[PDB]
Amino acid sequence: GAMEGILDFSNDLDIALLDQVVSTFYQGSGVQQKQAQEILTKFQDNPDAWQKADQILQFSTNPQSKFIALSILDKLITRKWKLLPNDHRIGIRNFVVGMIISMCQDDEVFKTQKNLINKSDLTLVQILKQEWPQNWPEFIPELIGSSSSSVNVCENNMIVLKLLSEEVFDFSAEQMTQAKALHLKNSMSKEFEQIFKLCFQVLEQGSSSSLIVATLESLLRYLHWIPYRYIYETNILELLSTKFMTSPDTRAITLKCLTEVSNLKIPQDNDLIKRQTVLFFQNTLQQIATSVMPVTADLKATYANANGNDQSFLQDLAMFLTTYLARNRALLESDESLRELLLNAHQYLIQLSKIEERELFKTTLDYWHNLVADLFYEPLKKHIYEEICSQLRLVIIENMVRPEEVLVVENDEGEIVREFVKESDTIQLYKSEREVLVYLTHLNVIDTEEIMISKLARQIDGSEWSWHNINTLSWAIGSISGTMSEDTEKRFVVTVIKDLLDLCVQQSGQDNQAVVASDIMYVVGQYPRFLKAHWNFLRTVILQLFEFMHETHEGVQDMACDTFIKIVQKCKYHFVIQQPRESEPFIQTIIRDIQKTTADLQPQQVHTFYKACGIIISEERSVAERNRLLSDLMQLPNMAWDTIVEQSTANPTLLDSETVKIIANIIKTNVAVCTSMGADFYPQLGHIYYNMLQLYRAVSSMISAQVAAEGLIATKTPKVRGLRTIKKEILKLVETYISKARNLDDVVKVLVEPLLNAVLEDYMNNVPDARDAEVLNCMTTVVEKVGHMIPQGVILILQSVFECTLDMINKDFTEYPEHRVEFYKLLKVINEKSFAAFLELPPAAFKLFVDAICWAFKHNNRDVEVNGLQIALDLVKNIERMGNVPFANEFHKNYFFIFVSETFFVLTDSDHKSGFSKQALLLMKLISLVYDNKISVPLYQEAEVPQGTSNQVYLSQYLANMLSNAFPHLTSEQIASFLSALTKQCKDLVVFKGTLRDFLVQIKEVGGDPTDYLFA
Amino acid sequence: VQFKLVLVGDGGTGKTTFVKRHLTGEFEKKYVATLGVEVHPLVFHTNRGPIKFNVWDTAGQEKFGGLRDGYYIQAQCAIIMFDVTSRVTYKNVPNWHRDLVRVCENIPIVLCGNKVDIKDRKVKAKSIVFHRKKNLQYYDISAKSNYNFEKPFLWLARKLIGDPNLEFVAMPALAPPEVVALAAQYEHDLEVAQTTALPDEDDDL
Amino acid sequence: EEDEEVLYKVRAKLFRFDKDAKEWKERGTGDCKFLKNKKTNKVRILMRRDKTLKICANHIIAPEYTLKPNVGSDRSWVYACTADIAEGEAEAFTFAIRFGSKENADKFKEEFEKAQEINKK
Ligand SMILES: *C1=CC(=O)O[C@@H](/C=C/C(=C\[C@H](C)C/C=C/C(C)=C/[C@@H](C)C(=O)[C@@H](C)[C@H](O)[C@@H](C)C/C(C)=C/C(=O)O)CC)[C@H]1C
Ligand SMILES: Nc1nc2c(ncn2[C@@H]2O[C@H](COP(=O)(O)OP(=O)(O)NP(=O)(O)O)[C@@H](O)[C@H]2O)c(=O)[nH]1
Ligand SMILES: [Cl-]
Ligand SMILES: [Cl-]
Ligand SMILES: [Cl-]
Ligand SMILES: [Cl-]
Ligand SMILES: [Mg+2]
């Protein structure tokens, strides 16, 4: 198109045309905009593009054009500056400076072209980073001088300095070498005296200017690093905390500066400084009260209204108060004359803590946590804050977020329904609230009780009744469990329950009932200690829960299940024993009636139920009695099972979806019970084990048959998915059991051979899409637990899954994601526990193993990458451990350099940044192996190098060459310097890593200083 | 009533997927890296009328960065994205913010922690504090589950319209038409459709 | 939707078939409603996304339409729609709609078929 003209550099740049392209991109739309965008990117990325910058700046009438011009320069300056002839550097400096001056002197431009001026300033700052002060020593004194000549220039200088400080102190770590960083910090520091003087003057001879704001913006940055004397030994605190608080255009920035001040590095034994720290706070609070809002002000209301910058201001105030107090409140606590101030500050916080804004609430809550945690320990402090804490109890009790256990929620139509999904983002909020409230309760249990007991009584008499109110209250009451003495707790809980049951009676209809049920269940679940001392009560609670298991209300029903197991998890012993005035242990009662109780439950709920019963059964330590209970519990699934095993062994025609589901649910139930019973599950496992493995085979045959007859698409079908669920659940059951098994001999002698026989060949001999990753997962646990006892087995596992799995996952990084992850976990544990298995591999297979490892490195998926790196490290150790033997020798000869280069590659490609640490570790280990002469054979082949040549010398040479070719823009000395530093530092990871990081900086530019690698 | 929204954040954080979800309703499983920027209009219906975002969905991968900060020019609002399963992406948040606010000095910005649907969360709730001093709104989101997916836009809408009580409302639903050669090909097309498996058959819906 | 009687409501996930690609693509999750116009007695499907309330389905339950199974699912229907105005201008789609359970899927089909009969009248 017409627009592509600008891409043809063999002809002059048509600026007018450029401007059109740019306008089209920014102001245009659809296809046109899109084309223009691509055109512009191409232009920008053109390595000569920069040469046009001056022409653009001069002749363009579009600020975006110039901005782009500046991005081009910025790229050139940051990446290639020292590649440029000297003349070109000067020229660039001059026209960047000139432009800035010129834009500052024209008021209209200065007022209306801020974006472009800001960009220009940053561009300049990039030049400074390269050139200053070594090749620009006068920059600052002249900047300083220039500032008096013009208000615009002066203001603009402030922007420049703010950017410089940012680039030097705040954002340098990732972007500069250690040496260069230091150099520029040092340089800034050596001249800050003068910088500050200007800053102070401007601040003195002004009130509410854009110049004042700019100055204050720069101060915010300086505060990150300047020595404290500049803050404390000048009049600056007075200015900030009085003058600059009074006008709103300066207020926001001032407050942020004062916040940073409240974190300055500051001596602790200096009374006068303490006084100053007190004074600025006192001033600041005085300004708020008189210029903004009194302490009584309704901050919730104000925030909710969202005028102007109110939300921001309130946020910054919270940040200011919390930061200051957290650090300094002790300064205010002893001196009676400071009491009012301390309390008023807190009262502001209390008011802010009523605001409806989750994130802001969390900020304040974190402060409260800090405070109460301190009051809980520190002698004679709590009484100061008694009234503050009392108001806090209210705020928290009334803003309790829904606990994760409370599964009912109000929909948009005012109906109490089951939640669609977990409220995942309120989990931490609840913990934080509970923590603070727990502390608050400990601080004054009488207050807390009185508050709760009377709020509650106001629900009963109806005066204050509402869903929100009973809820927040109930949740609060549940959340403080543990804070009272058993005895105190006892009466409290009695009163609460009585009242909730009262509400249960008075408040009817399904929605009301759902709410009250949820609340009671939450409360009861939260007080196991109580339950344990009140058997009758406990028993009645459980029975009531069972009733709920027949609720048509799904939310309540589901909650009953979770509450049941929640209670059982803590109280199980009381179900296992025979209670006074009971005819049988309660578990017996539960089991006898399990069909009735669980009839209306969803399958997974039924499994949860069975799981709970398992917890109870495992309390029984007498083996005969326990096994008997297990037997009884499993009676229904075992009978279903026994009849299924009949029908299928007569004829492999299971083809029934109903049957498939039944089987799946049988296994799932076994899994559920195994999960809670662990090692104790063994007898039940044995009842089904052999038939279960046969069934696994039968089902495997069906899946294959189905794929053959219908195609791969078969695997999507409900039928096939169902058959696989059987296989997966089988695998899960065995995995679960083996992970918890206590008798490893039976695992090996009884479980392992048939398992392997049943699953391995099937996995190996299925088409890729039919292979269950769960097999891999199972095998990991097997190797983990008994790998040391089954060398031949481990070999078998590898033979059957290694190559076929590798071939699934080695075409790209994305296909078969579960296989991929499980695959490397398996290799990991094999490499750890059964290294011998890899020693037995044929050389070809071992090479693929090495490949497999490196491939893992190159993943961005962290699950894979991390394991890759670990396996590599373990492998190196495994090899080292073997000593000077042929296998070790061969390994190094074939693979040492493969690992070194692969590790380097991922370190340096900018795409594996998450792995930096472990990469570094691995690299350091590899280098240390040579540096320590732990490699007994020459790593080179003969005639390649003189015969005597040490592995150290060779390693250097290899590396220099690899780097020279890989990064040809680096100088030899840069490479040599880097390698010397790095090899010397192969015993000190933190230093070694810094050297790596410096290198990653230098490879992104040209002309990096080789001496940088001497940093120490 | 249209506002420029720039969307920034590390490669692979879910920026484009998030947008697409809002655009078409779909969930894109494949990671195809954005090249420079993609501009998409996006409308929401509110009690205060319709609001239009021109979403400038920028490239997070340095090597596909294109004009970089040039995209930010005259942005009226923004969303900074990270991935709660990837700590580096949170670490880079202040870099994205820096570059952004240098061009866009006074705009409302939402910080979004994506992919919370993933079990193994790495950037703990508790750690997420960068937004506080910077006056950014924060939300845990998931483009996959739609967890809080509407929140960033609702918030931004409220700030730009300047009405805290702004809510999304149902668009009126025009009566649809009574319609009735292609019959032959529709058979073919339907076949292909029926026998292509629906994704995520193991989801709740 | 003031002039309309709600004959049936169910939570669903709606897909559209991208022919060019060969994949199903989610169009929306929310309440799928069968609505009878009180004045005309016509029955339409109207479906809106959760939270945004955006229309992802708006079409008559044409007598001509047939609910077909999907190979992957025991709880979905697929069908050709020749005139959906969710996106604005009438447009043809091959839709799939999935439910929380088979029961729900089977209930939808029955309801769909009844609606079709009403539309015939
Ligand atoms: C309203 C309607 C509904 O359908 O269900 C209700 C839910 C109730 C739940 C649990 C309650 C608390 C179970 C009831 C236990 C009960 C009455 C136990 C007595 C044996 C008992 O111990 C009584 C007499 C005393 O007074 C109790 C209440 C306090 C104690 C233990 C005093 C003491 O020991 O000193 C749902 C889980 C509701 C939704
Ligand atoms: N599990 C999960 N995956 C997600 C979510 N959002 C996006 N993804 C996945 O993450 C990958 C990257 O998504 P994408 O939208 O390309 O991210 P991006 O920020 O646009 N990448 P770029 O900056 O390179 O253009 C995709 O495979 C996508 O399916 C989410 O909420 N949950
Ligand atoms: Cl500009
Ligand atoms: Cl001084
Ligand atoms: Cl116990
Ligand atoms: Cl050199
Ligand atoms: Mg993208």
Side-chain angles (χ1 to χ4, degrees), chain A residues 1-206 208-1016, chain B, chain C:
Chain A
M3 289 196 306
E4 295 204 279
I6 72 185
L7 299 191
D8 183 3
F9 280 45
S10 81
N11 297 298
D12 314 332
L13 185 45
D14 188 335
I15 295 296
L17 187 56
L18 174 72
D19 290 352
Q20 197 198 35
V21 170
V22 169
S23 302
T24 295
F25 175 51
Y26 283 99
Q27 266 69 55
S29 72
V31 191
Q32 275 290 283
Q33 173 179 53
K34 171 187 178 138
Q35 284 166 352
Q37 198 284 142
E38 270 149 16
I39 286 171
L40 284 172
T41 293
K42 276 179 208 165
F43 182 85
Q44 178 199 245
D45 291 346
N46 183 309
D48 285 26
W50 65 269
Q51 302 200 239
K52 317 296 173 177
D54 197 17
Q55 192 195 350
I56 283 160
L57 300 187
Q58 283 174 46
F59 294 105
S60 184
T61 69
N62 185 333
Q64 282 76 70
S65 283
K66 308 193 188 174
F67 186 110
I68 276 158
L70 284 167
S71 298
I72 291 163
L73 282 175
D74 181 285
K75 188 83 210 156
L76 167 72
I77 289 152
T78 56
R79 299 209 67 188
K80 292 179 179 184
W81 188 243
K82 314 199 177 84
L83 185 62
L84 291 164
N86 202 70
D87 285 332
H88 285 106
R89 285 188 285 266
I90 290 168
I92 283 162
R93 185 201 291 203
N94 290 351
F95 76 63
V96 163
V97 168
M99 184 196 175
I100 288 177
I101 292 170
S102 155
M103 286 189 74
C104 281
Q105 288 174 357
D106 186 332
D107 288 306
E108 198 49 40
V109 174
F110 184 72
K111 177 180 82 203
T112 61
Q113 299 304 345
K114 297 297 197 195
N115 273 347
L116 180 58
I117 303 183
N118 283 336
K119 188 62 166 159
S120 294
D121 289 343
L122 184 60
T123 305
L124 169 52
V125 165
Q126 303 283 15
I127 295 165
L128 291 171
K129 279 152 74 176
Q130 299 289 344
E131 296 270 298
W132 172 87
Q134 62 280 358
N135 194 14
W136 205 340
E138 293 321 312
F139 174 67
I140 291 289
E142 291 185 347
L143 184 150
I144 286 200
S146 68
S147 292
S148 67
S149 74
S150 169
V151 156
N152 292 353
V153 169
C154 180
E155 176 182 322
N156 189 254
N157 281 341
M158 298 308 187
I159 294 175
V160 170
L161 289 175
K162 175 193 72 189
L163 293 167
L164 179 66
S165 188
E166 282 183 349
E167 290 297 290
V168 175
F169 290 89
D170 301 323
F171 301 116
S172 62
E174 278 153 23
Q175 288 159 40
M176 293 176 196
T177 60
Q178 294 175 106
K180 195 180 180 204
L182 180 60
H183 168 69
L184 293 171
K185 295 189 185 166
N186 273 345
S187 303
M188 266 205 78
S189 201
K190 279 167 204 187
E191 297 197 70
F192 185 70
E193 200 54 70
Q194 301 323 307
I195 295 169
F196 176 85
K197 189 156 172 302
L198 183 81
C199 274
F200 194 86
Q201 285 171 15
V202 166
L203 286 188
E204 267 208 332
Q205 315 144 191
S208 219
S209 256
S210 60
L211 172 55
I212 292 288
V213 170
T215 302
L216 286 167
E217 289 287 357
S218 72
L219 184 57
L220 179 48
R221 275 57 166 203
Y222 299 148
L223 287 169
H224 306 168
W225 66 270
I226 61 169
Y228 87 82
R229 58 172 157 108
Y230 283 101
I231 297 317
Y232 276 76
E233 290 169 15
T234 53
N235 202 38
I236 196 174
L237 285 176
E238 164 157 326
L239 293 189
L240 288 165
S241 71
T242 62
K243 190 182 181 190
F244 299 126
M245 282 298 297
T246 52
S247 50
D249 30 15
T250 64
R251 187 180 293 148
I253 185 55
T254 309
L255 199 54
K256 294 158 129 43
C257 284
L258 284 173
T259 294
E260 287 315 306
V261 164
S262 305
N263 297 318
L264 271 161
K265 184 153 59 65
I266 273 158
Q268 294 303 285
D269 50 22
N270 175 349
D271 289 341
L272 184 32
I273 278 169
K274 287 185 167 152
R275 253 182 281 282
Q276 294 172 262
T277 303
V278 164
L279 188 65
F280 83 76
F281 193 65
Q282 180 189 104
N283 285 346
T284 297
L285 274 284
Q286 176 56 19
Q287 297 298 319
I288 297 293
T290 66
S291 268
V292 189
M293 80 293 186
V295 206
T296 45
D298 188 350
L299 303 187
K300 175 186 177 67
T302 300
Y303 194 97
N305 294 354
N307 296 340
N309 297 294
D310 289 2
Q311 287 190 346
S312 255
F313 162 74
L314 290 179
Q315 288 165 23
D316 293 343
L317 183 58
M319 184 57 54
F320 171 66
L321 297 174
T322 54
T323 299
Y324 180 96
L325 288 170
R327 192 163 168 202
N328 299 303
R329 65 187 170 239
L331 295 181
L332 311 178
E333 284 172 350
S334 292
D335 184 342
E336 265 164 9
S337 69
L338 297 181
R339 184 58 55 91
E340 185 185 300
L341 167 61
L342 170 68
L343 289 183
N344 274 334
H346 282 89
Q347 185 62 35
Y348 275 122
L349 280 167
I350 283 285
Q351 292 306 83
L352 290 160
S353 301
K354 288 166 185 184
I355 294 178
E356 225 108 282
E357 174 73 277
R358 290 237 159 114
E359 291 307 313
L360 184 52
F361 191 73
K362 297 174 193 187
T363 299
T364 55
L365 193 58
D366 273 3
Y367 172 80
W368 291 128
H369 181 257
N370 172 288
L371 179 61
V372 292
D374 204 350
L375 295 180
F376 169 84
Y377 271 104
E378 196 59 31
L380 320 175
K381 298 304 210 192
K382 74 177 173 194
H383 81 276
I384 296 164
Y385 295 96
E386 264 166 8
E387 156 70 13
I388 292 305
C389 287
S390 198
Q391 296 179 67
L392 188 62
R393 285 179 192 102
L394 260 185
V395 168
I396 310 287
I397 287 158
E398 287 178 12
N399 202 225
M400 287 307 279
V401 72
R402 193 164 52 98
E404 68 174 65
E405 296 95 326
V406 178
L407 308 175
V408 297
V409 73
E410 174 174 359
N411 67 14
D412 288 318
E413 294 62 57
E415 292 181 293
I416 301 296
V417 300
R418 191 179 180 172
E419 70 185 0
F420 282 160
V421 287
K422 297 318 292 161
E423 205 60 78
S424 51
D425 77 349
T426 66
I427 292 313
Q428 181 63 62
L429 176 58
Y430 166 85
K431 281 164 189 166
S432 286
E433 290 182 325
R434 171 185 71 194
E435 195 166 45
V436 166
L437 191 56
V438 163
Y439 272 127
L440 282 165
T441 306
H442 181 101
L443 293 172
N444 197 311
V445 65
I446 293 174
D447 192 33
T448 307
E449 192 188 311
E450 278 166 347
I451 285 170
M452 291 176 163
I453 286 322
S454 68
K455 275 193 169 284
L456 194 45
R458 287 198 302 270
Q459 291 292 301
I460 275 81
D461 68 17
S463 69
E464 295 218 59
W465 167 253
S466 81
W467 290 338
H468 173 277
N469 290 346
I470 198 48
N471 279 349
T472 200
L473 178 66
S474 291
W475 304 341
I477 288 164
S479 79
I480 65 155
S481 178
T483 57
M484 306 177 179
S485 75
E486 179 154 0
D487 199 51
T488 301
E489 180 182 76
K490 143 83 184 189
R491 286 172 254 118
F492 175 62
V493 164
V494 168
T495 304
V496 174
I497 291 303
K498 271 180 184 172
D499 271 5
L500 283 186
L501 288 171
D502 206 8
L503 260 275
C504 156
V505 175
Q506 306 155 49
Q507 287 285 338
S508 48
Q510 102 136 200
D511 298 329
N512 275 351
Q513 287 290 112
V515 167
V516 171
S518 67
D519 278 341
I520 300 176
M521 280 188 273
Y522 177 72
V523 175
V524 302
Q526 273 297 111
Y527 289 96
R529 174 167 69 181
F530 187 84
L531 297 178
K532 291 190 207 185
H534 301 77
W535 170 250
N536 279 352
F537 183 70
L538 174 43
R539 190 201 65 249
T540 311
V541 166
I542 298 297
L543 289 172
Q544 175 61 243
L545 289 186
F546 290 178
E547 287 311 284
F548 285 158
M549 294 178 196
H550 314 302
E551 252 289 346
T552 66
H553 199 291
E554 294 196 333
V556 175
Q557 181 178 47
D558 199 31
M559 193 161 179
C561 297
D562 298 339
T563 304
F564 171 56
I565 203 169
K566 179 180 195 188
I567 285 166
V568 165
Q569 278 160 356
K570 299 302 191 272
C571 301
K572 66 254 197 195
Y573 175 72
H574 290 267
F575 293 79
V576 88
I577 67 183
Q578 190 169 328
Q579 297 283 347
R581 306 150 42 73
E582 305 288 347
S583 73
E584 49 174 36
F586 197 60
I587 181 68
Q588 171 164 311
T589 311
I590 295 171
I591 296 175
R592 293 183 167 215
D593 243 16
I594 196 151
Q595 182 148 68
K596 268 199 175 45
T597 308
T598 66
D600 312 308
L601 293 173
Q602 296 310 298
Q604 73 182 355
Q605 286 164 337
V606 169
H607 310 152
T608 292
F609 192 100
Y610 274 79
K611 184 161 69 195
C613 295
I615 300 171
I616 297 162
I617 289 174
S618 276
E619 288 303 289
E620 177 54 76
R621 293 332 297 166
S622 187
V623 179
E625 283 78 347
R626 191 176 56 242
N627 285 353
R628 186 70 175 243
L629 287 164
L630 178 46
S631 178
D632 293 344
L633 179 63
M634 293 313 282
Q635 186 179 318
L636 299 171
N638 279 344
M639 300 181 98
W641 178 251
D642 284 346
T643 91
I644 289 199
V645 164
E646 274 171 65
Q647 294 163 353
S648 83
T649 55
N651 32 295
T653 190
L654 231 309
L655 277 313
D656 191 325
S657 70
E658 218 56 75
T659 303
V660 167
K661 293 166 180 296
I662 282 157
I663 291 161
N665 282 321
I666 288 164
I667 301 294
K668 278 184 188 291
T669 301
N670 278 258
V671 168
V673 181
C674 189
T675 296
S676 58
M677 291 197 59
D680 298 334
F681 185 77
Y682 186 79
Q684 170 56 26
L685 186 55
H687 180 64
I688 69 181
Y689 193 65
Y690 296 135
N691 279 325
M692 176 183 67
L693 291 186
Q694 287 298 125
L695 172 64
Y696 188 98
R697 291 177 186 266
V699 155
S700 283
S701 282
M702 288 172 205
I703 290 163
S704 309
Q706 197 85 312
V707 169
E710 299 184 340
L712 288 184
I713 193 58
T715 51
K716 295 301 195 295
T717 65
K719 191 41 148 289
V720 172
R721 285 184 293 102
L723 295 165
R724 289 177 92 167
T725 291
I726 285 169
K727 285 177 82 180
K728 300 191 263 171
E729 292 296 335
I730 293 170
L731 286 164
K732 187 177 176 192
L733 177 58
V734 181
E735 191 284 317
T736 301
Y737 175 74
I738 294 173
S739 72
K740 296 167 197 289
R742 292 191 67 81
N743 189 328
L744 301 182
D745 287 340
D746 291 349
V747 170
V748 167
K749 303 266 206 126
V750 185
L751 300 182
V752 172
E753 193 182 355
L755 179 62
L756 290 199
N757 282 343
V759 312
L760 289 196
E761 214 180 315
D762 170 80
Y763 180 99
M764 189 175 76
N765 292 339
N766 255 346
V767 299
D769 282 359
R771 295 188 180 128
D772 304 305
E774 290 85 356
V775 169
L776 297 175
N777 175 83
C778 194
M779 286 313 99
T780 302
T781 297
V782 176
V783 175
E784 175 61 59
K785 297 302 158 168
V786 305
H788 64 288
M789 294 168 75
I790 60 157
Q792 288 308 307
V794 174
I795 290 162
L796 214 74
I797 291 166
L798 257 195
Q799 291 177 328
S800 306
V801 312
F802 174 61
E803 287 176 75
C804 68
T805 310
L806 181 51
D807 191 69
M808 290 170 72
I809 68 169
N810 74 0
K811 283 135 197 61
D812 58 58
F813 301 94
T814 67
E815 213 185 357
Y816 307 109
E818 289 80 27
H819 292 81
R820 208 173 279 280
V821 163
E822 300 300 320
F823 176 74
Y824 286 107
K825 284 186 193 164
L826 181 49
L827 295 190
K828 182 161 112 74
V829 62
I830 292 171
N831 187 47
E832 268 163 0
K833 305 276 187 152
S834 187
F835 180 54
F838 289 106
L839 302 171
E840 296 304 300
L841 286 183
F846 191 88
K847 181 209 138 276
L848 290 176
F849 175 46
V850 164
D851 293 348
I853 295 167
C854 293
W855 181 241
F857 295 173
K858 294 193 189 54
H859 284 67
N860 270 128
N861 176 337
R862 287 279 291 161
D863 209 317
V864 176
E865 170 187 64
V866 169
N867 276 337
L869 289 170
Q870 190 61 39
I871 289 162
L873 206 63
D874 294 346
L875 176 57
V876 161
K877 286 171 182 82
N878 285 339
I879 293 307
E880 194 190 332
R881 210 185 301 270
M882 293 178 84
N884 188 10
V885 304
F887 193 92
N889 293 338
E890 281 312 292
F891 170 86
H892 288 132
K893 284 205 317 207
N894 296 306
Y895 298 118
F896 180 77
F897 284 113
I898 282 171
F899 277 109
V900 167
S901 55
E902 294 299 314
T903 302
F904 253 103
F905 185 77
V906 287
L907 270 158
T908 62
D909 73 341
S910 280
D911 294 341
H912 302 86
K913 286 185 211 187
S914 56
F916 180 76
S917 270
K918 285 185 70 176
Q919 293 158 3
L921 190 59
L922 175 62
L923 184 56
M924 193 177 83
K925 176 60 175 181
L926 287 159
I927 290 174
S928 61
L929 280 183
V930 169
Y931 177 92
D932 283 335
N933 262 118
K934 286 266 178 49
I935 294 166
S936 316
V937 294
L939 284 173
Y940 50 95
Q941 68 223 6
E942 217 33 70
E944 184 176 22
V945 133
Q947 85 95 201
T949 309
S950 68
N951 270 346
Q952 288 90 346
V953 176
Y954 186 65
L955 175 55
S956 265
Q957 181 185 307
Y958 179 91
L959 280 176
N961 170 78
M962 178 185 76
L963 289 182
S964 163
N965 287 309
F967 309 101
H969 61 284
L970 298 177
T971 73
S972 301
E973 179 147 320
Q974 275 183 99
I975 288 152
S977 284
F978 161 66
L979 290 167
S980 169
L982 192 70
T983 54
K984 271 161 51 158
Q985 296 172 345
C986 73
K987 303 291 173 50
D988 187 2
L989 183 63
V990 68
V991 173
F992 193 90
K993 287 161 85 165
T995 288
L996 279 181
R997 279 187 199 105
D998 287 339
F999 185 74
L1000 299 178
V1001 164
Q1002 294 210 340
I1003 68 178
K1004 295 185 190 179
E1005 64 195 55
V1006 183
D1009 198 323
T1011 73
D1012 285 6
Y1013 299 110
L1014 293 179
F1015 189 80
Chain B
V1 186
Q2 88 196 296
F3 306 90
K4 180 174 183 171
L5 191 162
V6 292
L7 171 59
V8 302
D10 277 16
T13 58
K15 296 186 291 312
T16 300
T17 309
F18 177 67
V19 173
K20 278 204 181 158
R21 177 69 95 176
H22 274 286
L23 272 187
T24 64
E26 76 189 280
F27 183 79
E28 180 53 74
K29 304 169 174 288
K30 296 177 296 303
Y31 178 15
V32 182
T34 303
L35 302 173
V37 71
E38 272 193 307
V39 183
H40 283 109
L42 181 63
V43 186
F44 290 93
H45 297 102
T46 88
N47 58 349
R48 302 292 320 273
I51 182 174
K52 187 189 219 149
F53 300 93
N54 287 124
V55 171
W56 282 50
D57 164 31
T58 63
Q61 297 287 348
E62 196 184 326
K63 86 184 89 158
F64 302 131
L67 319 179
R68 317 158 224 87
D69 50 305
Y71 296 137
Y72 309 162
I73 296 160
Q74 284 159 30
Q76 290 157 301
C77 65
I79 292 176
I80 308 170
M81 202 76 78
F82 71 97
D83 173 355
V84 300
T85 75
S86 172
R87 306 170 52 61
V88 72
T89 71
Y90 183 66
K91 188 197 52 62
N92 280 320
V93 162
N95 301 334
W96 290 110
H97 176 260
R98 174 200 56 227
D99 297 356
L100 176 51
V101 296
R102 277 164 176 187
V103 179
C104 309
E105 278 175 303
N106 198 37
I107 61 159
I109 303 162
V110 194
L111 185 59
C112 293
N114 199 21
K115 302 199 192 181
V116 303
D117 57 281
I118 296 170
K119 172 187 183 47
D120 199 359
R121 187 170 176 149
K122 295 289 159 43
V123 177
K124 297 158 57 55
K126 209 159 171 44
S127 316
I128 303 174
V129 302
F130 178 69
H131 56 296
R132 296 165 166 188
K133 295 197 182 189
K134 306 302 182 174
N135 312 100
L136 324 180
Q137 184 52 271
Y138 176 71
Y139 303 110
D140 277 359
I141 72 164
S142 166
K144 190 164 192 204
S145 79
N146 292 311
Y147 190 80
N148 282 338
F149 85 120
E150 87 285 13
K151 296 289 198 310
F153 285 107
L154 177 54
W155 184 78
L156 281 177
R158 291 171 158 161
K159 297 288 271 187
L160 291 160
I161 299 316
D163 180 357
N165 299 321
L166 180 154
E167 305 285 11
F168 299 135
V169 303
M171 19 160 133
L174 298 72
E178 278 268 34
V179 169
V180 202
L182 252 295
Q185 204 68 126
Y186 274 22
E187 202 77 289
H188 172 67
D189 286 29
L190 191 64
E191 245 288 285
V192 182
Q194 283 180 77
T195 64
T196 309
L198 287 170
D200 309 304
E201 192 59 29
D202 278 329
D203 285 359
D204 284 330
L205 280 166
Chain C
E1 316 174 37
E2 291 56 43
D3 286 5
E4 283 165 321
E5 174 198 354
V6 183
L7 300 179
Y8 171 67
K9 186 182 71 249
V10 65
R11 217 190 147 54
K13 185 178 266 167
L14 183 64
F15 303 83
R16 70 173 160 91
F17 194 63
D18 185 316
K19 274 150 268 295
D20 287 329
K22 261 178 197 214
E23 42 176 285
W24 292 103
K25 290 183 182 199
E26 287 179 49
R27 209 191 197 209
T29 296
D31 292 356
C32 181
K33 309 184 184 205
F34 291 8
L35 303 171
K36 191 149 110 89
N37 188 289
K38 274 182 267 190
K39 303 176 160 62
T40 78
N41 294 324
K42 290 306 156 186
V43 186
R44 62 161 162 179
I45 280 174
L46 190 66
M47 197 182 161
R48 308 181 170 273
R49 303 194 188 132
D50 290 343
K51 296 318 218 301
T52 62
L53 296 177
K54 293 190 173 165
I55 307 174
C56 60
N58 188 10
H59 59 268
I60 292 283
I61 309 192
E64 288 87 6
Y65 294 161
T66 319
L67 299 175
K68 300 272 181 170
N70 185 261
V71 66
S73 197
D74 60 4
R75 60 178 179 118
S76 307
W77 303 111
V78 359
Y79 67 101
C81 180
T82 67
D84 185 90
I85 70 175
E87 297 281 299
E89 57 186 324
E91 199 177 346
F93 295 93
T94 310
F95 286 134
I97 183 167
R98 186 162 70 204
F99 312 82
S101 68
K102 183 187 190 308
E103 283 60 29
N104 272 10
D106 294 339
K107 185 51 169 37
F108 174 97
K109 163 156 159 86
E110 190 189 333
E111 284 297 329
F112 191 95
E113 281 170 26
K114 304 216 233 129
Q116 269 175 316
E117 294 296 339
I118 282 177
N119 278 338
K120 289 171 88 159
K121 288 188 229 133

